[PDB]
């Protein structure tokens, strides 16, 4: 019976592939062919944030567009005032091995996680004047690779156990569990309306999940290696995935298959972080070659290089107003770019 | 000075945060980082117990005015290549090998020899691109069990090309040589082999002086005298 069922699964896969091929009349490179090129995009480092001693793994900006949070392997979670490079807070982490960090949209909480399989939420606005561990979320059997805040009470976390989780912070339990990935999930990205989110895993596929229903709406498979980063388009109708095969890919939810591929012959290193500009025209991708490129989303042409780091660029963020772009790398320094 | 009173106080707070971070980093930099690795039932638990006597589990201990951190990653059911780069820069790697596994067939469940799987893991981590300079500290655990196993169970089960006799010394030396031959970074790193047991008490001393040798080597590389 298993053979018949897998043959039916293959027939369904072939039907999906035929449907995708049928609804592909023109390529993205043909519609976005006569449009004006973006031109050479040059950004200088405006601020350099020093104070981290070990290698940085994640950062998140926040809605206020001024503060930001950075996580490093030294065991410290540092909140920076990017305007003046001041350190607003320095939280000593219980577990030094952290690979992700999130800053709440309201700004009252900050999240972190890593090899300890626990997502720690810290209350920034404490009456005592310090920063306390508001909540510890456990239940994942793999390392936390990404985590983002729906609001002050709900959080979405991706771990290496091939599953994602939706937690209610107040009760500390998993309200929802998203399964279906056959590989470790390395990143997630929430839609602007917080109704859907995409998760990229090590199975070379990115899956779209509905937060409320809890089911997998769609899956996209165009990559040839592990997917390390993912980011929604500003309008929420598309997303971009970076992978270890030195290629980025722009997929569309409504089209249901891949739109664009971003690759160059002299780039052979994987992508550790991708991000979109405010308008979505520029796709900034951090590579393993110590650099960070700025691709043109519509034209797929390279627009500029952010080469100011002496080690792997591990994390990338763009302010909600798009004013500046922050790059955090393994050389223990963050850099703001304009 | 264009800053205001609140701005000046914020800058003072930032400077105090910097001074605390520097002190914490100086405290951390005087501490030894050991990455504990091994197969299932290899003997990591008894090594942790010996360290205590004298997600991720961390063990902290002290010997001869040196503080040792030992990260027993253990039950991390995930791809090793997605988080193994976090552990580069550790002072040493402590790999545990169970000798009595030389004739134990089940691996995870693949039904291919456990010693071969341990050798494959050792080859994978020793030749890993991140640990190109980190020195392995190989522990051949369960020597008491092996000393009785080899008497009645020949080593040819694991190594068909073994032409030596079935004695403790020859078979143990052969296993050590086979493990050391998997090292391809002969010049950059050294492998420190120690034959431990269930009830021996010299393990922490071996870790101490192996780390001392690694520190001397690193100091010579910093000076360039090596």
């Amino acid at each position, epitope marked *: 019976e298993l053979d018949q069922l897998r043959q039916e699964a293959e027939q369904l896969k072939n039907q999906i592939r035929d449907a995708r091929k049928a609804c592909a009349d023109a390529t993205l490179s043909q519609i976005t062919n006569n449009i004006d090129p973006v031109g050479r995009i040059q950004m200088r480092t405006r601020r350099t944030l020093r104070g981290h001693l070990a290698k940085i793994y994640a950062m998140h900006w926040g809605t206020d567009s*001024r*503060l930001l949070v950075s996580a490093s392997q030294d065991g410290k979670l540092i909140i920076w*005032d990017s305007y003046t490079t*001041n350190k*607003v*807070h320095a939280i000593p982490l219980r577990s030094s091995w952290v690979m992700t960090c999130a800053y709440a949209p309201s*700004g009252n909480y900050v999240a972190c996680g890593g090899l300890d399989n626990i997502c720690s939420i810290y209350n920034l*606005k404490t*009456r*005592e*004047g*310090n920063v306390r561990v508001s909540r510890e979320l456990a239940g994942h059997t793999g390392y936390l690779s990404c985590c983002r805040f729906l609001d002050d009470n709900q959080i979405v976390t991706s771990s290496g156990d091939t599953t994602c989780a939706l937690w209610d912070i107040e009760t500390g339990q998993q309200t929802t569990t998203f399964t279906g990935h056959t590989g470790d999930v390395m990143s997630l990205s929430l839609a602007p309306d917080t109704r859907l989110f995409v998760s990229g895993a090590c199975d070379a596929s990115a899956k779209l999940w509905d937060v409320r229903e809890g089911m997998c709406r769609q899956t996209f498979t165009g990559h040839e290696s592990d997917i390390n980063a993912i980011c929604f388009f500003p309008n929420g109708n598309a997303f971009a995935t970076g992978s270890d095969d030195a290629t980025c890919r722009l997929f569309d939810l409504r089209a249901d298959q891949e739109l664009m591929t971003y690759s160059h012959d002299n780039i052979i290193c994987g992508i550790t972080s991708v991000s979109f500009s405010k308008s979505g025209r520029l796709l900034l991708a951090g590579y393993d070659d110590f650099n960070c490129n700025v691709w043109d989303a519509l034209k797929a042409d390279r627009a500029g290089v952010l080469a100011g780091h002496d080690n792997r660029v591990s994390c990338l963020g763009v302010t909600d107003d798009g004013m500046a772009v922050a790059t955090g790398s393994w050389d223990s320094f963050l850099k703001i770019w304009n | 000075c*264009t800053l*205001s*009173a*609140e*701005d*000046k*106080a*914020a800058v*003072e*707070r930032s*400077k*105090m945060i910097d001074r605390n971070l520097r002190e914490d980093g100086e405290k951390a930099a005087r501490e030894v980082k050991l990455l504990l690795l091994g197969a299932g039932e290899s003997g990591k638990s008894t090594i942790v117990k010996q360290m205590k006597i004298i997600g991720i589990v961390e063990t902290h201990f002290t010997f001869k005015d040196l503080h040792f951190k030992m990260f027993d990653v253990g039950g991390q059911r995930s791809e090793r290549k997605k988080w193994i780069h976090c552990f580069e820069g550790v002072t040493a790697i402590i790999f545990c090998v169970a000798l009595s596994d030389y004739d134990l067939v089940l691996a995870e469940d693949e039904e291919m020899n456990r010693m071969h799987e341990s050798m494959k893991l050792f080859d994978s981590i020793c030749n890993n691109k991140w640990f190109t300079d980190t020195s392995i500290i190989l522990f051949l655990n369960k020597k008491d069990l092996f000393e009785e196993k080899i008497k009645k169970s020949p080593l040819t089960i694991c190594y068909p090309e073994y032409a030596g006799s079935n004695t403790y010394e020859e078979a143990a030396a052969y296993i050590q040589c086979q493990f050391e031959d998997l090292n391809k970074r002969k010049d950059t790193k050294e492998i420190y082999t120690h034959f431990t047991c269930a009830t021996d008490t010299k393990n922490v001393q071996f870790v101490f002086d192996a780390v001392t040798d690694v520190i001397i080597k690193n100091n010579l590389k910093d000076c360039g005298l090596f």
Partner: single-chain antibody, 236 residues
Framework: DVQLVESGGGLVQPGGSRKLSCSAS????????MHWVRQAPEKGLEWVAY????????YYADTVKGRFTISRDDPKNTLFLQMTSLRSEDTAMYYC??????????????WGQGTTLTVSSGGSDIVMTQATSSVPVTPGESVSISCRSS???????????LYWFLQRPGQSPQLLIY???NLASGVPDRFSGSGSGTAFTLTISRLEAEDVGVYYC?????????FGAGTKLELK
């Protein structure tokens, strides 16, 4: 919760010496800068002394410069004010106030109860002026408390350093609005701050019975802190 208790007040002859102790509880004392503030029996508040976190910087008022010494004992969580050569003008009630400074912080968040000192018998600073001494107000209405400054309180960084405090009868002052716009934690949304430059106003909507008291206007731009004359609020 969070509390500060003042001790060491008593009858003093002129030219004597005295020491005031603020004992803190319920918060990270070492991370908070500390202020000593004076309130004479009939007139308004006036800032006396300040010591930062870790004793990095210390500031005094010209009235108490030289005679007074403010210090902090972080491990025992105590704030000391050693005052010498006491004149008769220092008889007042003293408050120890906590204030933390970072982006988005709320300094002067909490005030101590105060201790009583009874001593038995200028220029180049911002003059904060509250012209109206008091207004008769019927509860349930909307009242506006005005304020003025000799020098503009708006800095080049976009922050207007104006604070609003309410001192109920028999109670320590309570912070209502910090930086002229932001509402303090636990403060009802009735209070609203506005204004620009040198003129500011505080608006209260749907006044209720616990709003009666004296409202004080304080500036934090130039560090010789000056409070307003105060505006008493009384029922009809």
């Amino acid at each position: 919760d969070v509390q500060l208790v003042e001790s060491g007040g008593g009858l003093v002859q002129p030219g004597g010496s005295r020491k005031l102790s603020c004992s803190a509880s319920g918060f990270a004392f070492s991370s908070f800068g500390m202020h000593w503030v004076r309130q004479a029996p009939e007139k308004g508040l006036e800032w006396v002394a300040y010591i930062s976190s870790g004793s990095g910087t210390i500031y005094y008022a010209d009235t108490v410069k030289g005679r007074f010494t403010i210090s902090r004992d972080d491990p025992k969580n105590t704030l000391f004010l050693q005052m010498t050569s006491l004149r008769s003008e220092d008889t007042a009630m003293y408050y120890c106030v906590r204030s933390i400074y970072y982006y988005g912080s709320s300094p002067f968040d909490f005030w101590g109860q105060g201790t009583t000192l009874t001593v038995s018998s200028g220029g180049s600073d911002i003059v904060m002026t509250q012209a109206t001494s008091s207004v008769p107000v019927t509860p349930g209405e909307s009242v506006s408390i005005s304020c003025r400054s000799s020098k503009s309180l708006l800095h080049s960084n976009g922050n207007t350093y104006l604070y609003w405090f309410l001192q109920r009868p028999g109670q320590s002052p309570q912070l209502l609005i910090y930086r002229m716009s932001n509402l303090a934690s636990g403060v009802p949304d009735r209070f609203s701050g506005s204004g620009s430059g040198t003129a500011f106003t505080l608006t209260i909507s749907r006044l209720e019975a616990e709003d009666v008291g004296v409202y004080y206007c304080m500036q934090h731009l130039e560090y010789p802190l000056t409070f307003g004359a105060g505006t008493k609020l009384e029922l009809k």
